[PDB]
Amino acid sequence: STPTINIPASPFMQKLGFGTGVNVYLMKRSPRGLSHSPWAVKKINPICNDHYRSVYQKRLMDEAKILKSLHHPNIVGYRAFTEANDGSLCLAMEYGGEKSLNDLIEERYKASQDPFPAAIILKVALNMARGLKYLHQEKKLLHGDIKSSNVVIKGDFETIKICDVGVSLPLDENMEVTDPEACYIGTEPWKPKEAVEENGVITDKADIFAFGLTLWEMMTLSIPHINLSNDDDDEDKTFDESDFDDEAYYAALGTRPPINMEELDESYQKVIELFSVCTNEDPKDRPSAAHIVEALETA
Amino acid sequence: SVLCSTPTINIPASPFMQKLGFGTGVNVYLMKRSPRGLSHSPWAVKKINPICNDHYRSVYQKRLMDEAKILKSLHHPNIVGYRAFTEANDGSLCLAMEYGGEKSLNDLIEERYKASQDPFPAAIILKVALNMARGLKYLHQEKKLLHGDIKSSNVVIKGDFETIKICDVGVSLPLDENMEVTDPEACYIGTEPWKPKEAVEENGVITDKADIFAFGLTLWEMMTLSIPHINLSNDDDDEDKTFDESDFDDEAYYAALGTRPPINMEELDESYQKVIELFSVCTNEDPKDRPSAAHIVEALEAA
Numbered sequence: 001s002t003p004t005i006n007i008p009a010s011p012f013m014q015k016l017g018f019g020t021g022v023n024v025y026l027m028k029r030s031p032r033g034l035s036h037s038p039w040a041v042k043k044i045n046p047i048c049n050d051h052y053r054s055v056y057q058k059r060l061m062d063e064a065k066i067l068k069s070l071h072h073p074n075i076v077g078y079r080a081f082t083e084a085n086d087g088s089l090c091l092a093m094e095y096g097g098e099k100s101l102n103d104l105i106e107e108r109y110k111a112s113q114d115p116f117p118a119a120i121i122l123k124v125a126l127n128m129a130r131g132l133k134y135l136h137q138e139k140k141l142l143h144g145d146i147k148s149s150n151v152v153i154k155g156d157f158e159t160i161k162i163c164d165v166g167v168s169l170p171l172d173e174n175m176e177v178t179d180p181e182a183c184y185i186g187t188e189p190w191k192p193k194e195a196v197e198e199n200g201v202i203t204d205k206a207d208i209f210a211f212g213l214t215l216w217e218m219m220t221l222s223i224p225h226i227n228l229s230n231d232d233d234d235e236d237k238t239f240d241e242s243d244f245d246d247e248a249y250y251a252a253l254g255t256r257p258p259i260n261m262e263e264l265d266e267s268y269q270k271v272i273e274l275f276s277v278c279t280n281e282d283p284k285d286r287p288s289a290a291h292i293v294e295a296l297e298t299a
Numbered sequence: 300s301v302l303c304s305t306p307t308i309n310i311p312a313s314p315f316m317q318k319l320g321f322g323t324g325v326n327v328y329l330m331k332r333s334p335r336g337l338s339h340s341p342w343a344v345k346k347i348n349p350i351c352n353d354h355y356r357s358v359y360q361k362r363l364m365d366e367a368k369i370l371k372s373l374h375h376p377n378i379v380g381y382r383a384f385t386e387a388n389d390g391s392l393c394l395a396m397e398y399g400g401e402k403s404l405n406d407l408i409e410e411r412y413k414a415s416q417d418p419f420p421a422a423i424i425l426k427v428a429l430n431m432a433r434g435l436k437y438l439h440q441e442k443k444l445l446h447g448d449i450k451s452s453n454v455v456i457k458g459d460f461e462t463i464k465i466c467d468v469g470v471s472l473p474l475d476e477n478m479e480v481t482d483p484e485a486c487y488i489g490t491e492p493w494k495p496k497e498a499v500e501e502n503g504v505i506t507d508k509a510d511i512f513a514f515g516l517t518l519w520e521m522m523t524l525s526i527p528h529i530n531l532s533n534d535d536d537d538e539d540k541t542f543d544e545s546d547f548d549d550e551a552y553y554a555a556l557g558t559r560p561p562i563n564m565e566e567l568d569e570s571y572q573k574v575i576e577l578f579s580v581c582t583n584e585d586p587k588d589r590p591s592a593a594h595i596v597e598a599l600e601a602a
């Protein structure tokens with residue numbers, strides 16, 4: 001068996017309401033090595049499933065400074081809680097409302113199931129552009145993951161903001177993510193063509209594309225490139241990976257989704273027009289964050 | 300160039316699109332019915348845009364009004380509480396876990412490993428022990444809430460042990476008038492290596508003592524700087540620079556979950572006497588043999 005060693009019934013241990021010795025097993029050398037191996041930190045007690053770190057993220061003081069410098073009515077920034085101890089510093093994303101656009105999208109789907117009014121779709125479009133302009137022209141940073149999930153709304157669209165701003169996609173002088181160890185990822189359904197090319201060139205327009213698909217969501221209340229494999233005329237009121245078109249999905253990844261003009265009307269004119277040019281197959285053909293702003297400002 | 304055939308339409312050149320630096324026309328495909336159903340299917344919300352990977356929702360969590368009341372009311376020196384950002388009344392409020400320092404006890408038990416490798420001084424372990432006990436006592440007595448999963452990574456340290464708080468407190472494991480989690484919904488999950496017998500058993504009963512067990516295991520972590528029941532079958536090739544899944548005795552693991560791990564007696568000394576006693580009683584197979592948080596606070600504030 002394993003070497004045991006009795007621990008005599010002490011007075012202190014009695015204070016714990018347990019008066020008796022306790023036998024315990026022995027261990028020569030603590031398997032520290034295995035417990036701290038990469039396998040362990042990865043499989044046992046995953047840091048991805050850890051709450052505190054998810055909120056208070058350890059950041060390299062240089063990035064931390066950049067992330068704390070984000071200051072714009074349409075961007076959600078970060079805040080620290082101490083002066084950079086030597087090396088890193090914890091940062092927490094600040095608050096920008098109780099709901100995310102995504103939350104409102106599905107909130108609606110379960111009620112009216114009616115597209116967002118054109119007036120509100122444009123408003124969001126304005127503020128999001130405003131915020132992208134700031135990120136692109138001011139901070140020289142590409143968001144890289146635009147979508148309804150990363151747009152938080154305050155009340156009845158009192159304020160529209162963009163969150164989860166990174167520091168890993170620095171925009172070169174030619175407004176192009178030239179940095180060597182910099183990879184665009186975003187969220188599959190929202191990826192631009194150049195993010196799928198496996199070799200394409202990531203420009204600032206990568207965001208404009210995603211910005212377009214986000215306006216699309218407010219029109220269709222749906223996810224880009226997710227269509228029922230076999231319609232059946234929207235028959236059964238239940239869906240799963242069986243009636244999902246694996247086919248069309250990986251096919252359209254990076255292309256402009258089909259517009260539901262049938263459900264919309266005439267007021268959604270500008271919305272559709274803006275959506276179209278932002279999803280244009282070619283990067284150069286897509287407006288700059290800035291262009292979209294003034295082109296929408298008083299015009 | 301593969302594409303497909305399907306209804307399309309032409310958006311005439313307009314002043315607007317021109318103003319967007321285009322001044323041309325665009326041809327767009329067409330859709331009659333929006334896949335709104337499939338998109339919000341329980342399947343879609345689970346595999347596409349996984350909220351478990353959403354940053355904003357990770358910090359600002361939506362809680363039911365009654366749960367937020369409880370969470371907002373957490374107020375103890377050794378408990379990391381929550382903060383709201385808008386006046387509630389509605390049937391749902393967002394709360395963010397508060398700040399309690401830069402490092403977790405797990406971070407420390409590991410900076411410690413990357414150097415000294417010498418088990419935290421006995422005195423510090425007792426300090427950590429008393430503070431955790433006070434916080435756990437607050438949860439059990441004052442709020443009637445079992446923590447759920449005590450472990451080093453859920454203990455945050457401020458500066459040089461200037462502050463020690465338990466975090467990630469939830470409300471789904473409410474305690475009985477009998478100190479047992481009987482709510483039909485409740486379900487002890489914890490973290491495998493730290494699970495007590497009761498939580499490993501097929502349908503054991505969970506009491507405030509389940510926390511005492513994992514609490515004990517956390518003190519063990521401070522002496523061994525290891526994860527409970529993670530041992531290599533190879534005492535032989537042990538000390539080999541790197542370690543892999545192929546050194547981990549998969550059986551001994553699942554066989555020891557819930558049992559008191561072995562104590563590295565030869566690495567400690569006689570100042571680790573109280574620490575070793577506390578560790579032992581807190582890890583008895585029988586919950587009734589483990590002291591309550593209250594009894595631990597008293598025994599440590601000794602005299």
Ligand SMILES: O=C(O)/C=C/c1ccc(O)cc1
Pocket residue numbers: 043044045046489490491492
């Ligand atoms: O709960 C955890 O964090 C870890 C679970 C786990 C389960 C089986 C393993 O072999 C390792 C980790």
Ligand SMILES: O=C(O)/C=C/c1ccc(O)cc1
Pocket residue numbers: 092093094095096382395396397398
């Ligand atoms: O955005 C704010 O006003 C405050 C945010 C915040 C986030 C985490 C905290 O621990 C405290 C404040």
Ligand SMILES: O=C(O)/C=C/c1ccc(O)cc1
Pocket residue numbers: 186187188189346347348349
């Ligand atoms: O990145 C995501 O959020 C989603 C990824 C994903 C990958 C394969 C699928 O079939 C669906 C979603």
Ligand SMILES: O=C(O)/C=C/c1ccc(O)cc1
Pocket residue numbers: 371381382383384385386387
């Ligand atoms: O409990 C909290 O931490 C926050 C309370 C709160 C109350 C009213 C506000 O307008 C914002 C926060």
